[PDB]
Amino acid sequence: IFPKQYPIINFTTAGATVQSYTNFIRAVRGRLTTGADVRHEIPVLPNRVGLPINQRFILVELSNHAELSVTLALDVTNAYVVGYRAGNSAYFFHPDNQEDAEAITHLFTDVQNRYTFAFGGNYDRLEQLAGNLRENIELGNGPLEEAISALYYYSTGGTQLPTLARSFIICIQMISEAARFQYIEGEMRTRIRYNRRSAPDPSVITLENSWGRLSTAIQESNQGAFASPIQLQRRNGSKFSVYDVSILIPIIALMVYRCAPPPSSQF
Amino acid sequence: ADVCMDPEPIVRIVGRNGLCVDVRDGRFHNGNAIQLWPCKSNTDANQLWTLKRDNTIRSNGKCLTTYGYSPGVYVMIYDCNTAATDATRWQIWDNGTIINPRSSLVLAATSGNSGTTLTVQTNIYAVSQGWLPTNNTQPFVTTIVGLYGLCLQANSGQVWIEDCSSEKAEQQWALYADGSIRPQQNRDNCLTSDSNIRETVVKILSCGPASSGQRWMFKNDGTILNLYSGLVLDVRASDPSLKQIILYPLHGDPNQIWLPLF
Ligand SMILES: *[C@@H]1O[C@H](CO)[C@@H](O[C@@H]2O[C@H](CO)[C@@H](O[C@@H]3O[C@H](CO[C@H]4O[C@H](CO)[C@@H](O)[C@H](O)[C@@H]4O)[C@@H](O)[C@H](O[C@H]4O[C@H](CO)[C@@H](O)[C@H](O)[C@@H]4O)[C@@H]3O)[C@H](O)[C@H]2NC(C)=O)[C@H](O)[C@H]1NC(C)=O
Ligand SMILES: *[C@@H]1O[C@H](CO)[C@@H](O[C@@H]2O[C@H](CO)[C@@H](O[C@@H]3O[C@H](CO[C@H]4O[C@H](CO)[C@@H](O)[C@H](O)[C@@H]4O)[C@@H](O)[C@H](O[C@H]4O[C@H](CO)[C@@H](O)[C@H](O)[C@@H]4O)[C@@H]3O)[C@H](O)[C@H]2NC(C)=O)[C@H](O)[C@H]1NC(C)=O
Ligand SMILES: OC[C@H]1O[C@@H](O[C@H]2[C@H](O)[C@@H](O)[C@H](O)O[C@@H]2CO)[C@H](O)[C@@H](O)[C@H]1O
């Protein structure tokens, strides 16, 4: 099927600063959504039913000023990493359904030969394979440099599975998760500004595990909002429950599509 | 999957100074006054409201109804059948307004005194006209981080941006259901600008007038908007040391981008 050429946003961790982080993420965000569907002020991503494969994935090229470079394929419908190309090689997480496995075929069509992992890129799997939870894995510019190098040397043979999986958790959190939430983006910019290496707080973990849940809650909400509180965490492990959309508007940047508007028009 | 199946949640409606929308003395007789009252812990029907698919708000079988379509009339409870169909009708907006679509006469509270009867008034986007459907009766206490990673800080009558000493003369804020941003240690004090035009006069002045200018929205694009004037919170010159947060139109630069860090 596919001709065209997917879109490419590149970032470099080399002389990384809070502005080039910030402009990397607006450029990712502006490449995931088409502007058509905003609901209670947040953008909604495309529906994977109605989508041509040429509109399906965007490409992120990351590099080091310390040599290497890798390209991650983001899926436009959930902003999440499906795989990557390193050198002459292309590696993909194991598609969990028949529609997706056909799609992934169109990603890095020039490569010598594509390899499909036995595991998925859902954190559950990746963190078991790293032997370490997201709370023990640090985030910051210096973690992503390392991760680009680990990703790059799995093609050659440094390889080592725990470390690959730990590099995947760092990339997905500093690109996909930061695109989805202006809270996690700013969290990553606090680390770059002060040269911190820091494991993410309980706040960050809960938002990430609630992305699909907040997208449903906001989309089937009423006006005002919602049929059930979504419970969330503070930076310190605490409390609160959310019953409405207004607190969520400066904190979710993108939502996955759950249901169409009441006709093509609303919010 | 499907067109979005929307619901009908049983929620409290919280509004000026933190008080919940209430059916007076717990009685449902046609004509009884809806009023502002301290929020209750328990399940008394007179403070819980069902947002129905047909756009009526219902405490215990009866609808919140406006007396008439004029600035000044009170809001009362009324059996939905007997009551004039589009006077039982209300829309709840993302920016905290419950309107009755017959001009923009808005649910309002004109005193924030316990027991005040609710009236409908013309829409000037004021604190006495911001409402939140929520069963969460306490405001959200956050730190607001803005230009160069600096925190918003109030020290008695002024507010400016300074660095986040995560314990300091405070810089933790309570964000109320009426749309006000209040300095957490003095909670009957409000982030206030005598807006309409501009400049620093984003002071900390009592919440009591409940003005437009004391009402603020945190938008998706990171700005803190004054709903009324249409201008956003702006650090003068992008210069933290001038110690002034003015009000200015949206250009989109970092000195107008803020974040709620909880
Ligand atoms: C914020 O806070 C308030 C108060 O704390 C919460 O209020 C509760 O809301 C829940 C869910 O919204 C309410 O629960 C449901 O009410 C249903 C009523 O149904 C009618 O059912 C029969 C037929 O089944 C009809 O003939 C008759 O007219 C009944 O009145 C119940 O059906 C639900 O419960 C029971 O359901 C199953 C299956 O039917 C029964 O078999 C079991 O007996 C089961 O126990 C359920 O009660 C609840 O009533 C509300 N509390 C109050 C006011 O009592 C808000 O939900 C919360 N807001 C948010 C957004 O979180
Ligand atoms: C606080 O929160 C509320 C949230 O709604 C804001 O209110 C509405 O503000 C909107 C802008 O978001 C006003 O918009 C204009 O809306 C009009 C029609 O939309 C209705 O019609 C369609 C279908 O016909 C319905 O699907 C939809 O659901 C609405 O019922 C249009 O007249 C406008 O379109 C035209 O504008 C100009 C023409 O001058 C051109 O761009 C085009 O011709 C364009 O077609 C535009 O869409 C809406 O009227 C407001 N009122 C209400 C009750 O919704 C508040 O404004 C906000 N407060 C603040 C301070 O921001
Ligand atoms: O209106 C104030 C307050 O009234 C409570 O109701 C009382 C009522 O005032 C009293 O006369 C009656 O004997 O018992 C009722 C329940 O305590 C409401 O419950 C409360 O919501 C407020 O609305």
Ligand SMILES: OC[C@H]1O[C@@H](O[C@H]2[C@H](O)[C@@H](O)[C@H](O)O[C@@H]2CO)[C@H](O)[C@@H](O)[C@H]1O
């Ligand atoms: O006057 C408020 C307005 O100032 C703009 O900025 C100028 C500033 O006036 C002056 O010191 C000099 O020209 O450089 C500044 C940087 O542009 C701000 O852009 C605007 O946000 C307001 O803060």
